[PDB]
Amino acid sequence: DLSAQIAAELPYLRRYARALTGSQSSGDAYALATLEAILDEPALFETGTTPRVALFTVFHTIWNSSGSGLARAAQRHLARLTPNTREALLLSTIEDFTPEEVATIMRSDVDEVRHLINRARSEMEDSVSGRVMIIEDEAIIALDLQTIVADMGHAITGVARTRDAAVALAGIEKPDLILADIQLADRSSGIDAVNEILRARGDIPVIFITAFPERLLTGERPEPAFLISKPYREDQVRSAISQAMFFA
Amino acid sequence: DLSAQIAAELPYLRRYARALTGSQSSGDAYALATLEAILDEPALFETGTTPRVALFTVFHTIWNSSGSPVSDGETGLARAAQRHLARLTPNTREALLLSTIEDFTPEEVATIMRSDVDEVRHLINRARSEMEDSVSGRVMIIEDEAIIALDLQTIVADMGHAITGVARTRDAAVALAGIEKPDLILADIQLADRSSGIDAVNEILRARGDIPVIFITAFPERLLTGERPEPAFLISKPYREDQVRSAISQAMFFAS
Amino acid sequence: DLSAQIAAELPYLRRYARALTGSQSSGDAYALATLEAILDEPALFETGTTPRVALFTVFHTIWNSLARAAQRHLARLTPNTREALLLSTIEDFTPEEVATIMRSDVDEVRHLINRARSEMEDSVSGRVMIIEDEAIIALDLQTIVADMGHAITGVARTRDAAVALAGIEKPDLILADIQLADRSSGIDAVNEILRARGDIPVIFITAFPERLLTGERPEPAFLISKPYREDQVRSAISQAMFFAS
Ligand SMILES: [Mg+2]
Ligand SMILES: [Mg+2]
Ligand SMILES: [Mg+2]
Ligand code: NA
Ligand code: NA
Ligand code: NA
Ligand code: NA
């Protein structure tokens, strides 16, 4: 049933729009506007592609149209990016669309998609080095994330395996970015650890890395702006880190 | 990466030059004259300072000099604010705008103006003094986000100006300007009914003549390209109170 | 009508062949030879591909049938590498399009394109005067030239200023826009500079490249089209540098 197929894909649309905007409120609003457009003008929903691709195609139309807070530092960083490059990269990595599917969604051809992705990775080489804190109780995961962070040119403030170790580490050195698992070693939650750090140290971008990200993509309650799945591919971690970094 | 860094900063050099001149025309001409001076004399660029600071340091040398921009048209102040040139202390408006709207620290403003941090602080103190010598005007606020509109009103009132009212739609804005002519307009782009604050401003400008307009918007970079008609005065969202105060005083100099 | 479709692609074949040879006279002759071949031997022309693709395919077939120190370096370049690069960058052909044109596989096209991009790192830094009247464009061209490893002798924005700057430092390569700030022409500036300091390779930057590809009057050997991609400016400056000295 197409109603049920669209409903199943809405969480991922929220994931994508939240990553583009850095915000749950903006991302969830763009995802909702996409569904509204499809209900108001059903002819917008291409039936010759998969519902997932058709849904994201409509979202990219709304995304391109002027319309619908953000730090002025983030606004300056984002303003220097080549248009449509971050969209093509995120669609290709975190959303795992093939290059032809990406060309469909952005109403382009596959060779321009390849250029946009290549331009995305070029501008990622000019980015400044930041400091990243990792909240993760599985030591092999933490070590793997450290390797990815380092090869991106970033520094690690440290690894925290419990909420309390995380609140303590953030007090020693305010990170530029937090990578956060949910269930920690002492059965405390990375969600609480993050909330406590942010109350104390101000807004810092946070990427939650979790199995079943769908449970944080409902739109019904406060939820993260950046979500990577477990298991993860390295390309998805690099895209999320570079994306969240724009929001300092 | 100096070339890339200088080009990234050119939009902000336009913002600054436009505020000082009162016109997109002369401001864009002054910012492009700054870049043309660096390409002509690369040694003009200080590598010992950030590209942003070095760019603005070159701009201030040109601004202060007896010379004028060799541009496609005519460069200059704005005629309206010529009468205030006799009452204002040199380098005070420059120091205030650089340290507020342009977000330079007083040490970076000292470098830019080839001065010391203490002279810059006194220049900023003398700018705020001469702001008390300014007469009260009437400000119209076009803005649909009510909390921002309220906040803007508290700043305007705290500076001693009156507020004609707040309009949240293009239709409310054309009515408001007809009820009471404003000396200055603060305008957002996307209004409550999705109508356009640019369109609203143009309509007011037709009926009442030239009134200084300050556009308040996120991503001001999209109005700082010099590739199309664009505002002379731009405040960012989010803003700091000191930036709103520096933009309201600056634009008031160009009022009737 | 396939005759008109072929005619409309001739200017771009002249661009390609001129850049490969470094000379208007040779590039225009190679482009005409390609049309002549198709008229003489209609079998050469494949109707299953786009008329632009089929025309470049016939030219590559024909393509395969100065200064000793400059020839000594150009001889170290791997065969078919410059062609695959220029076809993919300035000619905006897709990898599969280039593979058809060279009667190769898209696999080999990337092997070639990579080898060419790697052999560009073995290039010598060179002086590059930029005659652009739009400062924003000049800054961006200075970025690509500097990243490639070349110096910038200067940036001029008027005919008289470019002629003056040529007197201070003889460039090895001139990037020249057609219409300058004082309504002067970069063509006249380039001609006056070359008349004085001798022959120097020139890459003309221009919106409207087709009106410089007629073959009916003296025209540039190398042309970058506004707007441009960095890969295009990089393929045009590497190609043109082969003819510097
Ligand atoms: Mg865990
Ligand atoms: Mg608004
Ligand atoms: Mg021009
Ligand atoms: Na669709
Ligand atoms: Na982008
Ligand atoms: Na997300
Ligand atoms: Na020639």
Side-chain angles (χ1 to χ4, degrees):
Chain A
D1 256 301
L2 231 194
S3 48
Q5 285 176 106
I6 294 165
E9 301 291 347
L10 283 187
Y12 313 116
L13 189 55
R14 288 184 190 103
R15 179 177 63 202
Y16 177 52
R18 286 170 182 180
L20 283 171
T21 62
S23 177
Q24 198 217 345
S25 59
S26 304
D28 285 349
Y30 264 108
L32 180 59
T34 302
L35 183 55
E36 292 171 345
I38 291 156
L39 297 184
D40 295 344
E41 292 272 21
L44 271 168
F45 195 86
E46 177 53 56
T47 42
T49 65
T50 57
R52 175 174 179 72
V53 159
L55 175 68
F56 275 77
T57 303
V58 174
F59 164 72
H60 192 69
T61 294
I62 288 139
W63 183 245
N64 266 125
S65 304
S66 85
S68 307
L70 188 40
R72 268 302 290 132
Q75 284 174 25
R76 283 186 84 151
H77 206 339
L78 286 158
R80 311 185 307 231
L81 296 181
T82 305
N84 291 306
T85 57
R86 298 305 300 185
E87 294 86 351
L89 176 70
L90 299 174
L91 283 168
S92 299
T93 54
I94 294 164
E95 293 316 315
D96 196 18
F97 283 112
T98 74
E100 178 59 80
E101 287 170 341
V102 172
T104 299
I105 289 153
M106 324 182 44
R107 306 183 190 262
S108 211
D109 60 62
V110 71
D111 284 292
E112 217 215 326
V113 170
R114 300 175 165 126
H115 288 310
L116 287 164
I117 291 165
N118 290 319
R119 172 58 58 64
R121 303 213 218 258
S122 265
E123 294 206 316
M124 275 175 77
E125 294 162 22
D126 300 321
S127 96
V128 284
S129 163
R131 311 170 299 290
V132 177
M133 147 189 197
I134 294 163
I135 308 178
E136 165 69 58
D137 58 315
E138 286 185 53
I140 175 65
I141 315 278
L143 287 173
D144 187 41
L145 291 179
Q146 270 211 351
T147 295
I148 299 158
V149 170
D151 178 56
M152 291 185 74
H154 296 300
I156 295 107
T157 68
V159 173
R161 303 179 57 261
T162 64
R163 171 199 44 236
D164 295 341
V167 169
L169 164 56
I172 298 152
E173 173 172 18
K174 177 160 162 192
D176 295 324
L177 167 75
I178 295 162
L179 300 193
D181 170 51
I182 313 270
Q183 198 255 297
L184 299 184
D186 52 0
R187 324 205 207 165
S188 67
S189 178
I191 304 168
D192 296 317
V194 162
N195 289 340
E196 195 173 344
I197 291 160
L198 292 194
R199 284 195 310 263
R201 313 291 166 220
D203 213 43
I204 295 148
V206 180
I207 301 157
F208 278 86
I209 305 156
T210 183
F212 298 100
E214 294 89 346
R215 284 129 154 60
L216 293 177
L217 289 165
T218 72
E220 304 163 335
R221 78 188 47 90
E223 283 168 331
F226 299 104
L227 273 158
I228 281 305
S229 348
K230 296 178 142 192
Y232 54 76
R233 293 188 330 252
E234 151 149 27
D235 65 298
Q236 310 186 316
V237 184
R238 288 184 172 286
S239 285
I241 287 167
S242 52
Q243 191 72 13
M245 261 318 184
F246 300 131
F247 302 90
Chain B
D1 312 311
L2 285 211
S3 295
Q5 282 177 110
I6 290 142
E9 300 297 325
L10 277 163
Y12 310 114
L13 196 66
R14 297 188 178 91
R15 183 181 44 193
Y16 180 55
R18 286 185 195 178
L20 292 166
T21 59
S23 94
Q24 153 180 37
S25 186
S26 311
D28 287 351
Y30 257 104
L32 200 59
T34 301
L35 171 57
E36 281 175 11
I38 289 153
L39 296 168
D40 282 353
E41 193 184 331
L44 267 182
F45 210 69
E46 181 54 44
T47 47
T49 65
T50 73
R52 192 178 163 81
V53 168
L55 178 59
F56 275 77
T57 308
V58 175
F59 167 93
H60 193 257
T61 297
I62 305 173
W63 179 250
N64 217 239
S65 90
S66 332
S68 51
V70 170
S71 89
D72 180 72
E74 271 205 282
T75 35
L77 187 51
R79 308 255 269 112
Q82 275 271 334
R83 71 217 209 221
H84 299 114
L85 297 177
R87 83 163 214 96
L88 300 171
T89 300
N91 301 119
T92 54
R93 301 306 305 177
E94 292 86 351
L96 182 75
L97 287 191
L98 282 170
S99 63
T100 55
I101 296 172
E102 290 307 324
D103 268 326
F104 289 114
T105 69
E107 253 290 1
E108 285 181 329
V109 172
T111 298
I112 285 151
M113 302 168 92
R114 257 82 74 92
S115 187
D116 56 270
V117 76
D118 286 277
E119 176 146 23
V120 169
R121 284 193 226 111
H122 172 251
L123 276 164
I124 290 154
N125 289 317
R126 287 315 314 314
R128 280 137 125 125
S129 319
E130 286 166 14
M131 280 156 80
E132 74 178 57
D133 316 341
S134 84
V135 64
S136 316
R138 318 216 54 110
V139 188
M140 183 187 162
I141 292 160
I142 311 169
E143 164 73 70
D144 63 303
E145 290 184 73
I147 288 146
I148 301 180
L150 186 66
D151 192 58
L152 289 172
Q153 191 167 332
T154 66
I155 297 158
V156 173
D158 184 68
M159 301 163 76
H161 294 303
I163 291 92
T164 58
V166 169
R168 303 173 62 254
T169 50
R170 191 236 90 203
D171 278 314
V174 293
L176 181 46
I179 294 162
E180 174 159 43
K181 206 242 195 83
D183 308 311
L184 167 74
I185 303 157
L186 316 181
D188 178 44
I189 312 285
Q190 168 195 138
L191 298 190
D193 55 350
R194 284 137 290 191
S195 71
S196 150
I198 299 166
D199 288 345
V201 164
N202 291 324
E203 282 187 54
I204 295 153
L205 292 198
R206 193 145 56 241
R208 308 283 235 165
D210 194 84
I211 300 163
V213 186
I214 303 165
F215 273 91
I216 307 197
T217 187
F219 289 105
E221 295 97 332
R222 71 201 217 171
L223 294 171
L224 292 168
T225 74
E227 281 158 15
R228 79 188 41 79
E230 290 167 319
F233 305 107
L234 260 171
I235 280 308
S236 318
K237 294 206 233 170
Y239 55 78
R240 277 191 334 260
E241 177 166 322
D242 55 296
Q243 305 175 317
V244 172
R245 283 169 168 319
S246 288
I248 285 168
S249 33
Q250 186 63 26
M252 262 318 191
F253 286 127
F254 300 85
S256 318
Chain C
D1 165 45
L2 186 49
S3 302
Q5 318 216 351
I6 285 153
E9 301 300 332
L10 188 50
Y12 313 113
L13 185 54
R14 290 171 173 100
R15 200 175 50 192
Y16 183 51
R18 285 189 202 167
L20 282 178
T21 60
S23 124
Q24 190 207 349
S25 46
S26 307
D28 290 347
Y30 262 112
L32 253 47
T34 302
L35 198 26
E36 293 167 0
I38 284 141
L39 300 172
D40 296 348
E41 205 34 275
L44 298 166
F45 192 82
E46 176 55 63
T47 61
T49 64
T50 88
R52 186 174 209 216
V53 164
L55 177 70
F56 275 74
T57 302
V58 171
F59 162 81
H60 190 76
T61 297
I62 289 176
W63 181 245
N64 284 302
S65 320
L66 255 294
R68 275 298 307 129
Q71 292 166 53
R72 278 161 74 80
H73 176 284
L74 256 162
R76 284 161 101 191
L77 304 191
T78 286
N80 290 312
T81 61
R82 296 312 296 183
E83 293 88 342
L85 178 66
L86 291 168
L87 284 172
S88 282
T89 56
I90 288 120
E91 294 308 312
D92 269 1
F93 283 118
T94 82
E96 49 262 38
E97 281 173 349
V98 180
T100 306
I101 290 159
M102 317 189 42
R103 284 161 190 321
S104 298
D105 202 61
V106 190
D107 168 40
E108 334 182 29
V109 164
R110 305 298 253 301
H111 286 358
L112 288 169
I113 283 170
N114 292 315
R115 172 78 54 85
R117 224 83 94 143
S118 90
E119 283 180 315
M120 302 218 230
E121 307 195 328
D122 290 53
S123 72
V124 47
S125 161
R127 287 161 296 281
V128 176
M129 147 163 230
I130 294 159
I131 316 173
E132 166 62 68
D133 74 326
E134 292 190 70
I136 187 56
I137 302 166
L139 240 184
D140 183 34
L141 291 171
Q142 258 203 24
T143 318
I144 306 137
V145 167
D147 180 59
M148 269 193 282
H150 302 286
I152 285 100
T153 69
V155 166
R157 301 193 293 294
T158 159
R159 171 143 88 279
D160 319 323
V163 159
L165 182 279
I168 289 171
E169 175 146 7
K170 177 239 163 213
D172 315 310
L173 171 76
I174 302 191
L175 297 148
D177 167 42
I178 308 267
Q179 242 308 342
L180 296 187
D182 62 312
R183 314 186 101 98
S184 76
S185 179
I187 294 152
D188 298 322
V190 153
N191 287 341
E192 190 176 347
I193 291 167
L194 287 207
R195 185 176 311 116
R197 326 289 164 190
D199 170 59
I200 303 148
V202 179
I203 306 155
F204 271 92
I205 322 308
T206 183
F208 318 122
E210 294 91 346
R211 42 177 298 231
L212 294 176
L213 298 164
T214 74
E216 307 158 340
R217 74 201 43 89
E219 288 166 332
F222 308 95
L223 268 160
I224 279 292
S225 320
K226 288 206 262 213
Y228 51 84
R229 277 201 317 301
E230 169 162 43
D231 69 329
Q232 303 189 141
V233 173
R234 281 180 166 302
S235 290
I237 284 165
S238 34
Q239 192 72 14
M241 256 310 155
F242 300 144
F243 304 87
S245 148

